[PDB]
Amino acid sequence: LPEDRSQHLGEELQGYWDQEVLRAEKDAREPSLTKAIIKCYWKSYVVLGIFTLIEESTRVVQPIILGKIIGYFENYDPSDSAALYEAHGYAGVLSACTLVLAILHHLYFYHVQCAGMRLRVAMCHMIYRKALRLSNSAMGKTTTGQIVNLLSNDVNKFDQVTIFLHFLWAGPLQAIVVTALLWMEIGISCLAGMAVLIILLPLQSCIGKLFSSLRSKTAAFTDTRIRTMNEVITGIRIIKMYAWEKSFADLITNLRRKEISKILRSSYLRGMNLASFFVASKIIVFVTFTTYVFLGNVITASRVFVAVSLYGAVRLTVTLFFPSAVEKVSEAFVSIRRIKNFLLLDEITQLMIVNVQDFTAFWDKASDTPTLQSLSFTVRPGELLAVVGPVGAGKSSLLSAVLGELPPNQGQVSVHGRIAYVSQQPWVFSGTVRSNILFGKKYEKERYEKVIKACALKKDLQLLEDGDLTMIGDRGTTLSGGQKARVNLARAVYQDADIYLLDDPLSAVDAEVSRHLFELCICQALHEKIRILVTHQLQYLKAASQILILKDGQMVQKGKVGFKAYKNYFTAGAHWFIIIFLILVNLAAQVSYILQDWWLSYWANQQSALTEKLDLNWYLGIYSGLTASTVLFGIVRSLLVFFVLVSSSQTLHNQMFESILRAPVLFFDRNPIGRILNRFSKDIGHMDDLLPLTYLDFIQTFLQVIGVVGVAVAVIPWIAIPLVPLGIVFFVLRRYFLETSRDVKRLESTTRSPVFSHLSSSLQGLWTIRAYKAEQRFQELFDSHQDLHSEAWFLFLTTSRWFAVRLDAICAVFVIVVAFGSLILAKTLDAGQVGLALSYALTLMGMFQWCVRQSAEVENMMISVERVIEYTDLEKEAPWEYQKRPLPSWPHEGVIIFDNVNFSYSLDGPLVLKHLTALIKSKEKVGIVGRTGAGKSSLIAALFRLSEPEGKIWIDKILTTEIGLHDLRKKMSIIPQEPVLFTGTMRKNLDPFNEHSDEELWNALEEVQLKEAIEDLPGKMDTELAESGSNFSVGQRQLVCLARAILRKNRILIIDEATANVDPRTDELIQKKIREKFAHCTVLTIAHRLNTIIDSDKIMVLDSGRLKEYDEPYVLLQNRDSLFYKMVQQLGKAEAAALTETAKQVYFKRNYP
Template identity: 45%
Template sequence: MAQPVMLSRLVLYFSTDLVSTTEAYLQALGMSLSSLLILIASHFCYFGYWITGMRLRTACSGLIFRKALRLSNLALGETTIGQLVNILSNDVNRFDLAFRLLHYLWIAPLQLTIVVALAWREIGVSCLAGTSILIFMAPLQIYIGKLASKFRSKTALLSDARIRIMNEVISGIRVIKIYAWEHSFGKLVAESRAKEVRKILHSAYLHAIIGALRFDGALLTTFITFIVYASLGNPVTPSKVFPVLALFYSARICLSNNFPFAIMHGSEGLVSIRRIQMFLLMDELQRHVNEPNTDVMDDIFLEEQTALLDEIKADDTLKNDKLDISEHPESAQTNRTNSVIESADNGELVDYLRTAVSEEEEPVETNPHANKLNTGTDVRAQIVVENMYGSWNKDTRNTVLQDVSFRIQPGELLAVIGPVGCGKSSLLAALLGEIPTVSGVNTLNGRVGYTAQQPWILSGSLRDNILFGSKYKQAKYQRIIKHCALTRDIELLPEGDLTLVGERGVTLSGGQRARVSLARALYSDVDVYLLDDPLSAVDPAVGRHLFEKCILHEMRDKAVIIVTHQLQFIDKADKILILQEGKVAGYGTYKELQEDGMDFASLLKKKSEDGDYDGEDKQDVNPERLDDKVSICSDDSDGVETPVGIVPEEMAAGTVEWMVYIRFLVAAAGVPFALVWVIVVVGAQALLSYADVWLAMWTNEEENDLVDRNITSQYYQDGTEYGNRSYYVRIYAILCGATTAASFLRAFLFYHVFVTASKALHNQMFDAIIRAPMQFFDTNSVGRILNRFAKDIGYMDDVLPSTFTEFLELSLGAIATVIVISIFNPFCLAFTLPIAVVFHFTRKYYLASSRDVKRLEGKARSPVFSHLSATLTGLSTVRAFKAQQRFTADFDGYLDGHTRAWFLFLSATRWFGIQLDFLCVLVITGVSLTCIFAADLLDLNSGIVGLSLIYAMSLMGEFQWAVRQSAELENQMTSVERVCQYIDIKPEAPLQTDHMPPPDWPQDGGITLQDVSLRYSDDGPLVLREINCAIRPTEKVGIVGRTGAGKSSLMTVLMRLAEPTGTIMIDGINTALIGLHDLRKKVSFIPQDPVLFSGTLRKNLDPFSGHSDSDIWRAFEEVELKPAIEELPDKLEAVLTEGGTNFSVGQRQLLCLARAILRKNKILIVDEATANVDIRTDRLIQATIRRRFKHCTVLTIAHRLNTIMDSDKVMVLDAGQLIEFDEPYVLLQKEDGIFSKMVQETGKAEAVKLLQIARKTSTTLKT
């Protein structure tokens, strides 16, 4: 505010003799020093604002992640991973922008007051006319800010929806490609994006209004002020105009730019705060399962221990000889306990037992009873459930578990069985506290190890997934690896157990993932194990080994609950719990349930088929032999022959290429429209500068007239008008009006262009991603891809338009300033040219590092999103293992990595700003001094001097901000660059070609492979080697082989998820010549892991609405889901949650089978669809496939040999080669054959049964 006063004195030097030359130099020096002080203070404050915003953003990010770890399942159903990614990528970033400008909410009114006071001093009451414009703008800007806040709220919700869809698309891309659903999901994403863009456009137009007002604010204020001033009869002279103009210019950035943007960003920040607040107020888990109900537990404990008294006293082992402590220290503890018990009466015993509960001593293993009487928590029942009712939403009327009761001691094994959807997994969820207990007792005592039904694998090494944060102990680790049958698998991995397994364990097979999950639970060495169907994903021999070595041996002293569909193992359990529709249908020992009339015969009918071992076959499995044959059949289709590991994220280096800018503009509106827009932009600035020059000319004319006539202001008050005033006013009014119109046109065109470009580039990126080959998704994490759709697109939507606008406005203004100053004072070129050279090298020096720092910051964001996504996917496992603290620490580490990069960027930006502002101080100094020095030489008038000095002062803030924004623009263009990188991904083969097959192709379903080989990369190993075979129409072919044999690769080439060499013919047509959709639409596929998408049931089965309701209901009827669907309120329009989690895994698999039925194709590929279902559902799926696809060609990747023994042929793969291919019975005649050895390794009894099935099938085929 002091600078306009100094300017007033300096202008008087050129028009009067009231100011001496010495004072003029002192005023010029004062302007320079004040500018230097402004430089120091402003940059110090701005750096503090940015750091404060960064700290708040980081704190909120950590808080959001910690909250996510505590969300209840009800809350998780109300939010999505995409929504959380959007909050972390966009909402918390509002704090960075808001804190940079928030202080202007109080500075702007204060500055306005000072401006009015100083302007009143110069021109009196006329200043109120101009300042009223600024005052009027304040409520207008507040209103616009509120509107922007509303649009921001709506935009955020739409962004959440789009990111949620994108998360599902990327996670389920394999299924989308196989089902040829690209167009359906493309339409869904395009519609979601279109809705989002409509709201973004509304916000953009509001930004355009504010930008235009900012551009025109000082001009309109000056115009109104001096029109009023002149109309009151006052002389419009430079000594009056330019000090006031300097005041308005000094207030322009604050009042017309920072203040409205502070309101807008503050309003948008409030929206983000409300969104974060809503998330933080979501329902949390209320109960910690490892904190038992003490009163209930004590009562149960005392009851149990009193009941044990007689048993212990009667035990012969406690009445035998006393042992020497030195020889048998463990028995000494038993005898010491026994002596207390024998000498105590009942009251003393109760007191003793209460003491035992509280002492928390280490348990000492002795005889079977010692485990139950040792001090510590193990003396209590480990799990007590009495009359428990559980509901996902705490609604007692809608319970998933009803009146469930059981009790488990340490060392007991409880098997939970029942049909699909009966509540088995829900029971484990209730024990973990994931499902609220609405009534009854649900107490779990001790630490928990948990294996989920769908194994959860982190993106890291295999060893890290097993250790799960525990300390590495080699002997223990090797023992567990051996017992989990992972030794051979680890030997086959490129880096052993240090091999990176990829996101979600993409490089591991399903069986490997299940065994890694089991090994993780074992290594944790906890008190309670909750195992959700851990044996379904492995073949019978491996399943038997895991059950004996892991569950019966390693967990022998623990409380274990195993949910299983493998009924051949339940007779080894201490207790069996049978669930039916959430209720207990039976509970007791195997013998007790038989005596109660439980018909195990029907339940166990499938027992022998699934690898039962009776009589002499009940011996232990030889682990050395098992390690050699691990996964002999299959683990699933996703073996390690897929591309290994997540590749490092691509990061460009150096300058952002001009082609990126061109692509951005072309994406917006094309070259012709861009040229029109450039003309409007330059024209608006030219009009503004010429209006200021015209004002200078007007004031100079009036001053000259005053000097010539030697008259006073009284002359004007008497009504006499200066001769050409009307002319100057008219032209000035026309220039102001044209400038205003051009600025509004420019602003609206600008924001429209940018939003259009963002929309176009988003759609292009999605089209490129949906068409990318599967190898891209196998080597890039979900979080990395989502980062581009969330953060980078968010930058293009919100930040980039404002940055580009400010850069163009300020840079054009700076150029106009230099031109105007140089035209009227050529001496300025003597210092502006050297300063320009210094500026060029300073900018070059800054950009050399800031670009890469910004790219590093963008790259550092991806792990934050990936970790959040992975954690939420496996949240139940994380909470079960009490690993929240470790995962929080990992998240904080990723967040700190991003913060470090961001801090480097802020520091570099602030350094650059200081350098530029210092150069501007030199410009101000040079302009003021040269004007004084060259006043007589150039015959400078006060109007031109005043305008030059005002421009020089405004240059300080505007020039450095323009240059910084140019650097910031290039930094932010890295988001466009990153989007373009994905747009340029090489796509798959065309979806359709000129070689279209007949509409009814394939009619028969015959498949021929000729010299088919496959590499996943040009320098990668062969995963398929010259496969030659012919599959006749309607043949049923089983595909077996060890892990990595090439089973999934064979499915991959059949579906053309990767392009092989050689030829694949289906009914005589080369599949390489037809479009991908023409192929994939004609082949049905049932995956092992069922994939469903949020949306209606109808859309999940028939996204193109190509089938009638009756067809869909018929498909449901064939998979026996019709009754369950009819019970839903909306039936076919019932909405599935993300991933279809409101259906059980078995029900999801049946829905996938219904999809296959609905497609009515002649070829079906089954990727072991019965791995995660109960026996009844297994039978249903197998029977449905045999009945419904009787006249189709069926290829089945086998987990269990019994599922493919009745096939027409069996294909045996090893190391990518086709080793055997014939009828099962024929292959079994080869004693040294691989398939024959596989059958023999299942055990004698099982081998005999498999041989009988093969013989029967062979006889049937011959007849």
């Protein structure tokens, strides 16, 4: 609608803000953004205030009308037909009050949401209007992320605050009025219930502090676990090969033990919070009527149940809404105060020939020296002025000065003509690349085509699939530098400006293209224009008409889930005895809750049957028992639900973690790291923190809903007949709304993000959009994004409002049926039972809506539980230990036989190794050779059985398929291509089983010469490492890998060649260490750098997944037809000469031996 469009709706508030700023200047005081908001929207907040006044009046009138209805029974007389009509009258008014609430909520729900959205949309538009105008100083104080959080976080307070604001007055006032009326019903006793009721607000706030502290404390463990988990998932392939999987299992379980320990305490503490809301009503009424009866008053159905109903009105608003209003309105003023600051940062103050007069400028007046100094120059159309000099000499600052970004400290600049600007860092924004080029000038294909050829983009329009109608991201990330660079030139040309300011734009493209762009675009096409070019191409400099040389700024020259998921989530937590006990505690909580109120109804009726008097020791004693049992089972329920469901989130995490460890490497390939870790972070996070509270709050409310209906059916059993249609209506209605609502809910969630991405993109482009005088066109584009989301949000509002109004309608009908159903059956039932029925029915509205709401949220979050469940079901690698276990001394010799070995990463995948059949003799040194990308390392995956091979692999005649995976994996030793240091201690990275002597560790660390860094580390070997060990170089990590291999003494060594990540001066040193140490080992090495293997005893060549050659390297090189000879020959003549020399020497010596 025209009144809610972003442009119009914000523009008025910008008007009010300017007027407040003008007033504040005249008043010589600071401007207040709150006063600007209030003056703009007070006409809306006043009508919202009236609705709260009316709503709270009817919510207080309802109890007093209920008193009149019950009064019909306390003096019942079947002859008084007049009294029957009068009782029907109040039942009529009670009915109206319930529908008036249903209508007021129906109107109030709409206007409050609109009142909030209007303020949000208006503020966003002002925030953007300001962002386009910030002086370059202010970009130094703020950051794009800090500004974007104004839209993402801080403005999103306001459309919450508009809900609660009027409770800051309606809450206090309603407490007074409800206290005043309770003084009518009860007298002084009302102060007892109110004393408790106010004491709840300090207690609930205090609990909030303990929870916040515990919540803050636990976060450290969570982050510790997730980081450990992330390095686990990332490292899993290497973790598996070292068989360190036991270590991380111990580590994570320790971290998870501690974290759930904190989560249990925090969750119990929060269970006391929800328990309070449950029992609060029952204690308030206990203390009130206990004091009332000690003061000598008799209990009678009218006064008791009118009072009970009045506490229901004030209790919820004083304990729930008003504390929420003080919190959220406080967050409003924090946010408003923050936005007031942003709106008040320094603003740029902009006012054919170009002329410059002798000028000095500071990017910061806090600088001791200028950034441009004494500069004066002039240029006019038909010239090219170059700007030349060192990096940081001021070259780009000159262009900013002609553009007007840098204001003068002295001297002045003046120009006439349209400016064009091209930044050395290109910028491109969400749109078609044609749009990025047209920039919103009128399209002319006939000349645009000339630009597209003139800017040589036509070639790249062949690579763009949709050509120039391919969309480009808001940060250009899908384009390459040379493309987005060429895109900026294409934009600049089409704007067909008069003054071209070019910040070294062509260096992004090759010289031939650059000079093609220079010659056609810069020299010929701009020639009718002013041209100012920073460039380092001296061929262009000499083609320039004149040159300015800069130094130090001075002139040098002017030259849904199924039930099974639910069953699992509870059953996983505890034995079914506790869960059955959980059900009973739940029911016992609710039944004792209702029975407390039934006891007042029973106590009333017994009193009515009556000097003689009732024995308080019986009635008031049992009453105290029913309150106590309500309190006990309310607390126990709360704690016990959190126990079972948090206990379950422990068990499901551990089943999932063991699954992931046991999951084959295929799993970590097919699912990227972040998607796995998302389970352990978001989904486990929901299961621990959010989901158990939501279950507890649902079950708490739901049983009261069933409680309200059950009491009404218990007292007036024919109400069962009116209910069964109403339940079918409810059930059908719920399903239909949940089917259609979920789609519009997502739509609102997606249309929001374009608002923030536009602000982000425009801030990055801030000079170019403002250089092109495009500020207001970008405001139009933001309004387009802004009031696109407004359409989606309105459809969500009306969809939700359509459900809510008729959810209240069936709730209103319920009160009608009880109200008149009581009177139609009046002869059969007695005052206390009507009060019990009606005082409960009056509470159904609100709790019923929240019940349905929380129902949806439970079903929603159960999606995350379902996602962990599947990760408990992942297929597993074969057992870590088979029934057979190898001899304790095996492997004796490390004779490895490949026989028909056939391997694939997946059974459904290609066979990357086939018929692979080779003997590796004990202590034999064998190199593995294969073309890059041949899958050469697939041999490693087969030997460590990361996927089960077909055929037979034997080690000392033990069939590696027929032994436990940890037995096989531990006893070989592997040096990986990329090193990994885990953020344990240095000792952990070397010896996580903690079984090696420290003397061995120091020997290893000496043998790799890394000990110096470990002596530099303060804790010695107990030193903590950095994140990923980043304190060590990538080379030093590879030194550790040697250390690990040195420590893990085994007959069999494998190397994956990438030791050139050590600097050559130490790469070669560890390469020698490998030679010197592992002479005791059978050694395999797979390499690209054939020089590294070349001294092997044999080389295996696998260019295509077959063992094409397996022979002495010299004999291979003597075979001039060998692939290895051809490969070294493909390295080159001197390479082969060097390689053949090495092979000849070692072959001769071994033959001369």
